[PDB]
Design a protein around this nucleic acid. Structure first.
Ligand code: MG
Ligand code: MG
Lengths: 469, 419, 469, 419
DNA sequence: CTAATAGATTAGAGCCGTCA
RNA sequence: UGACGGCUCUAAUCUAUUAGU
DNA sequence: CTAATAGATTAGAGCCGTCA
RNA sequence: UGACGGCUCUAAUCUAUUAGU
């Protein structure tokens, strides 16, 4: 018979200084913080894709209702919510002849055809950006289904270009990094899910009751890529910097050369929120070792600290380095050597593979969202996925697992660490959802790790998150 | 006056009407509507007439398919017409067309010659038009403050959406270990046992460590597999108490706490495996671990304590299974997880990973918390021996006991489970 | 006695398909062709500069009235004219400390100090374009007057730094070509003209009676640089692409040598004007030889023909080569070897050297703008500057020089060439005036050449004009 | 009754209706139309009828492919016809055609006998037509603004202002060459003259070419500087008539038709230099050319035929100067380039480029066409020889005649000079 | 250096469901 | 790859020991 | 190859008015 | 460099010819 405590909802701040507990309700009731004036879109593909996007734009201009108004909130329209226009009149279109796709998707070698298709798209995108007098803000790519199906790594068709990954999306985003052009990719099947069926007369994907969620997600992503700030956290205390580190492998190389990437978040002294990836891919030649060499660790910490100093004016009073792996002693010593005097260094590990579930005996509904179990002074079990009283439903289907949060190195309070980890999960901009199972700092970094790994020619990659998600 | 009436088709037009009411309140307009308030009762019609006649400045009618030809809506329309006639106000009733299906040809006679504010295309355009019309007609208003709208949202939208300070009881998958032997053993067989005898084949758990064998069994135990065992002195046995090595208070150059704890965990795992093999239960090989499952018809009518464990799905049979792991953190436990497996007819397995995974995904859609809880508890209670325990044989006389009831957790905050 | 012939003016095509002869009234009545939603302005500079910029942006909202309406039209407000928003609310500031500016301009060497100033100004722009989340349409640089007077070719104060021309504007626009960022440069005196004075109590530059023209010029510049098209030519004959070549000397690069740059215009499908450059200097080692080797000439014709073929799909029916030099037989024999049989090459020369002048008898005003004197089948005088009855004044003082048009190569009608050259003078997007004195093909090519030859070699430079002017 | 009604087809002609309404409002009229003035919550038919009947001075109809055959447009037309009959105003309804696809033989039957205004060519032309009609019909204009509405009115009426057909006579700065010497000659001095005699310093114009000297003078001329010339056979000469030289005819191995039209040009330039040296005219050395100017007071009170050539500007005196260049394209002419030079005391120039440039720029502000023309004509008339001709000396007897009046050009297009 | 035996870490893939 | 969740099948590495080094 | 005499072309820099 | 125009000063180059190379 142990004891559990409760952790309250984070508050996400909205326009006019009013607060809420759900992003959707705040967006649909008040409006965003900044006011973008307009969005100009660029469509690339066949005439079918252009018609698909035009129809989808015309459709999303009016309110769409879901199955349940309480389970999933409504969509009162793109312009009625975001106070900006994104319609099918400012579209700038670039065609790709179907013979080009046919002449390219016959080589039967995934690397060569992936490179060829990525080139066939990016060359036209870059040429349109370079040699045209218009102003395109967000570039939408309608990827054909037959192109998508066979560009997976472990998929089969029923040297110079080998220094690249075997995925269309990764390499396509990778070779556009040095030209600074925001990009959004839509599957052809996703936008028009009705016309694509199987040998049963029914859509492969049923979006009948969940068009509101789809509209929310796409509108939020398009707004964020266009330079909008929808919502910000409420009570982030001054002087705290969160820095997540994610490790990755590399597809082809003389050695495994495990790569390290980082992501950063803190307060901007202007009552805002700075959330940017501080990433210059660091390398470890040793096989299987997920600890950086002392020089790499010194470089990473120095870069992060210098970025914080330039952004604000002084060093941070507290640094929580979130990582999914434990740290060894030498890496922590190297972190300590480049550390200022009045700077507390904390190493926290978040893990998921820990077999433990809790069952409610009386009802058939899962556990509360904000509960927490404190094993000791240096570890705890935190719940984030489950039933929320506001949305009257569970975030997952089965009995969810909690997260194991461990204060591996340094001295910190477990309740405060849990509170911060819970509050960090309301700032996922790639989708518009109530809550997630993983904090954003260790999530967005992952995406960076899977973009600037597909190619090796990038030097000084961009930092803003509008070119990676 | 200073109030604006809103009428709709309760509860068909909750979305637009509630959105418009919250928006208009956020701009400093006093808005009176039905669904906005919570307290109701018999005295709900006299207030309507008194408010309309006494302190109502503008009448907005949400004209949709549902709201048209509605008895209450038509009564409100008649009262509004009477008030408009009395006040000599030409513009008192304003239609708001929010339904695309509602054509202007089949509209009510009471509103057929009136200029309607359209909301079908974009709700922001209609909101701007309403604001402009109010400004031109000099509708009284206060300063724009979204705080009132936020307060109304917090006190009306989330009335029965708060959290309940109610105590509760939680069942888990953590089974506590009750009993341990007294001492551990490192029998010293100086080139006495065969070099490659494969000590993991003995009738009792054992682990090789230097020239020593580690087991909880007796010194002369498992002598059937090792005939050259009797000629051995007792003084050549290093005995270590279990309490200190579980507490971490035994550091030696012979062995440290880490390796001894590792050996204890390995012994517990092997004992669990052998004991479950004794129960005559079928085995399943996963990617890294191993699971245990019952046949079909092994129990009485495929049930145990009114809980079914084996069933029929399409042309196959589905079997519930549990997997255990011997772990010493934070306190000595044998963690339990659940799985589902599929067989052709309940006796022979189907050799296809994709079929098994797809079948499990299909089956797990409709199962909820209570189903998993009941199945897990039932299968745990199946294993227990006499009243509350389940023993693993670690030697000729040594036993390790695991309780059949999982560890409970007590919480103080819950919800009201409102269907 | 000799006779003078007259040609009417080719009016342009404003919104709603309306046409007018003057740009000011054409915009004031019908508005621009494309409709922007609003202009977000980013400002780089000091605090005083930001304050002045906000003051001017506020001032240009209300109507501004000129001294004489007949000569110069009024300014009725930015929103009323261009149908878009440009307010002092989307202004984004990046501070450059006066300490850095003062300390950088102390080396007493024009090359080193110019290099330092350019690097300081462009590093912040690159960082704010690659790392931050906001959107910037046009970057308005506000340089103090104390650095403009010292960043000149022959300027005296009262390391890869010697490879660039010692001018701030040219190098600044040349170094940002690979990042594709529009820029508009302001002097602190251009905006706050009343505050800057002289020994007497009067400003150096008096905008009291020409304030409306200043407002119109800055408004149209900001409209174009934000992605707007203020107007286009009414009539362009089909199948005909017009070129313009300019030679520029590459000062102090291992030898005295020279390069060539081009610009082109044609009418594409959809009644649109493709007004774009032709980039990539083509050199020749000989000094003072304002000509091209055959190898470079073949490349130029091939590139122009392929550029037209890509957009149109047909080889051009007629090609015109406006230039201010004279062709020889070697390079024209290099031509016509890649020219299609269904193509006619006319090499036309425009110059303002031959000193002819005409005075009206017993009068006070100058000759009209449309007059032309045809000496032969292969020579003409055209008065591109003169009196305009519509504005009741002349475009210049004294007596303007006539413009010499000489068909140096090819067979064509003199009237048609004169009409085309007159029509190519209505495309001054950088200004809001009645017409320009020289064809835009011979001026925008020079603007390109002044920029491309003030830096190191850069591969595939952008072809749009908003990144140069 | 001071409101103008506009009838259109909503929403097919919203753009033109809004444009015309905004233009008319800016002009000063009171305009009533659907989209601009659409009250919300009011009976639109009764309000429209009241507006048409009680306060309506004009009925502007918009006729196009959309507004044709429309119920509301037709009803408004009928009510406007009734009002016109009740008011006895034959110019009450004004059609405005804005569609090029609407033929004149398919118009509404109610406007066939009415004078429409064409907006096809340009909305400005039609706007001025309707404003002229309103001014003729005395439409009440509510002028409530000054210096803004008047400036809006003055802005238009000027874009349509254009040129008028009238022949005009222009002067020029080209002096036509009237005649040439018959023969040009190449005197053969077989290494007789000194190798570096610097032939350009003698009295007559001559140019070296191989072993020959080219000049218009006779064989025994310029013997004062070359005494060893008499002993020379006169048959050792090559004569080519100049008329065929200035015809693109002569070509030979001795000299090509090209070097010809350069040697003649050089000789003409040298002759002009010598002639202007002989006239006692002071000289100035520019960057590339040489200019000639008159001293102060050498004319009678610095005036020649009611035109002044030397004047006063603060602490400087300004002098008109000319420079000459002989050209053969298209026909033999002398080009004269104007300059203004500045002197301190009227006799000495200033050896400073900056002050000369600044003074010239200051002087160039006040002059206009008449000043420049009169000054050039007066200068050339002073340089005249007898009545209309002026000769350049090429030798003992040969001379080149050039007129003293510039070539007159004639044109067919001019302007009315609207002060 | 390699090859068996256990624990305790980590990272790559691919598959199904989201409502009633 | 518009999201998120939960699964199954695979690979390095560290520690401990033994035997081939 | 160097240096003078010309014609005939070409490119750069530097400065002032724009109204009454 | 917010535009435009008009002037002023310098410096290559090509062509013809002449003399030492
Ligand atoms: Mg994305
Ligand atoms: Mg410019």
């Amino acid at each position: 018979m142990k004891e559990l405590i409760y952790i309250e909802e984070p508050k996400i701040l909205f326009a006019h200084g009013q607060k809420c507990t759900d992003a959707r309700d705040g967006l649909a009731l008040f409006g965003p913080l900044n006011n973008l004036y307009g969005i100009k879109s660029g469509v690339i593909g066949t005439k079918q894709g252009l018609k698909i996007f035009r129809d989808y734009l015309d459709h999303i201009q009016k309110p769409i209702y879901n199955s349940n108004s309480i389970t999933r909130p409504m969509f009162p329209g793109f312009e009625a919510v975001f106070d900006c226009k994104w319609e099918s009149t400012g579209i700038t279109f670039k065609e790709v002849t179907n013979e080009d796709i046919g002449k390219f998707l016959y080589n039967s070698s995934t690397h060569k055809r992936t490179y060829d298709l990525v080139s066939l798209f990016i060359d036209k995108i870059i040429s349109a950006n370079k040699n045209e007098d218009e102003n395109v803000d967000v570039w939408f790519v309608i990827v054909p289904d037959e192109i998508y199906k066979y560009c997976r790594p472990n998929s089969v068709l029923p040297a110079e270009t080998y220094n690249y990954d075997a995925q269309f999306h990764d390499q396509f985003k990778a070779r556009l990094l040095k030209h600074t052009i925001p990009t959004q990719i839509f599957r052809e099947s996703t936008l028009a899910w009705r016309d694509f069926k199987n040998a049963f007369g029914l859509p492969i994907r049923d979006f009948s009751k969940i068009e509101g969620h789809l509209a929310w997600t796409i509108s939020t992503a398009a707004f964020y890529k266009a330079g909008g700030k929808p919502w910000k956290l409420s009570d982030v205390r001054n002087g705290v910097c969160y820095l997540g580190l994610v490790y990755k492998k590399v597809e082809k190389s003389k050695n495994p050369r495990n790569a390290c990437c980082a992501a950063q978040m803190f307060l901007d002294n202007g009552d805002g929120t700075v959330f940017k990836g501080e990433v210059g891919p660091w390398y470890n030649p040793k096989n299987g070792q997920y600890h950086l060499e002392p020089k790499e660790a010194k470089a990473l910490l120095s870069q992060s600290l210098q970025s914080y100093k330039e952004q604000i004016g002084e060093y941070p009073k507290e640094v929580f380095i979130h990582a999914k792996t434990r740290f060894n002693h030498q890496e922590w010593d190297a972190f300590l050597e480049v550390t200022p005097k009045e700077t507390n260094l904390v190493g926290v590990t978040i893990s998921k593979t820990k077999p433990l579930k809790l069952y409610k005996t009386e009802g058939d509904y899962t556990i509360l969202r904000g509960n927490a179990y404190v094993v000791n002074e240096r570890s705890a079990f935190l719940w984030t996925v489950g039933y929320v009283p506001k949305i009257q439903t569970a975030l997952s289907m089965e009995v969810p697992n909690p997260l194991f949060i461990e204060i591996n190195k340094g001295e910190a309070d477990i309740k405060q660490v849990l509170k911060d980890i819970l509050s960090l999960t309301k700032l996922n901009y790639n989708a518009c959802i109530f809550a997630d199972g993983e904090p954003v700092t260790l999530r967005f970094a992952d995406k960076i790790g899977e973009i600037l790994t597909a190619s090796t020619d990038i030097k000084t990659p961009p930092l803003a998150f509008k070119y990676y998600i | 006056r200073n109030k604006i009436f809103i009428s709709h088709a309760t509860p068909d037009d909750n979305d637009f009407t509630r959105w418009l009411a919250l928006k208009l309140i956020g701009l400093g307009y006093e808005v009176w509507c039905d669904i906005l308030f919570l307290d109701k009762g018999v005295d709900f019609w006299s207030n309507i007439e008194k408010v309309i006649r006494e302190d109502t400045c503008k009448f907005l009618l949400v004209s949709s398919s549902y709201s048209n030809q509605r008895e209450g809506v038509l009564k409100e329309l008649a009262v509004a017409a009477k008030v408009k006639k009395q006040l000599k106000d030409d513009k008192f009733i304003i239609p708001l067309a929010i339904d695309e299906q509602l054509s202007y040809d089949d509209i009510n006679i009471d509103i057929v010659r009136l200029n309607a504010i359209d909301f079908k295309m974009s709700w922001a355009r209609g909101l701007k038009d309403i604001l402009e019309a109010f400004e031109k007609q000099k509708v009284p208003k206060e300063v724009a403050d979204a705080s009132k709208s936020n307060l109304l949202y917090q006190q009306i939208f989330l009335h029965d959406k708060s959290v309940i300070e109610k105590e509760e009881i939680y069942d888990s998958n953590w089974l506590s270990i009750l009993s341990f032997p007294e001492e551990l053993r490192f029998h010293e067989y100086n080139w006495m046992l065969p070099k490659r005898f494969d000590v993991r084949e003995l009738t009792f758990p054992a682990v090789r460590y230097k020239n020593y064998l580690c087991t909880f069994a007796w010194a002369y135990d498992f002598t059937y597999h090792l005939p050259k065992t009797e000629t051995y002195h007792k003084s050549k046995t290093i005995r270590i108490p279990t309490e200190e090595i579980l507490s971490g208070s035994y550091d030696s150059n012979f062995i440290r706490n880490a390796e001894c704890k590792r050996l204890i965990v390995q012994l517990l795992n092997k004992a669990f495996e052998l004991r479950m093999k004794d129960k005559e239960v079928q085995e399943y090989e996963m990617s890294n671990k191993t699971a245990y499952w019952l046949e079909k018809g092994k129990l009485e009518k495929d049930k145990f304590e009114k809980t079914m464990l084996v069933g029929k799905q399409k042309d196959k049979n589905w079997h519930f299974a549990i997997s255990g792991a011997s772990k010493l953190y934070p306190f000595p436990v044998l963690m339990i997880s659940s799985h589902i497996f599929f067989t052709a007819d309940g006796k022979k397995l189907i050799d296809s990973s994709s079929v098994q995974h797809s079948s499990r995904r299909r089956q797990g859609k409709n199962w909820w918390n209570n189903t998993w809880r009941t199945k897990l508890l039932a299968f745990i209670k199946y294993l227990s021996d006499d009243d509350t325990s389940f023993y693993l044989e670690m030697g000729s006389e040594e036993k390790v006991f695991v309780s059949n009831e999982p560890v409970k957790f007590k919480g103080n905050v819950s919800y009201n489970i409102p269907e």
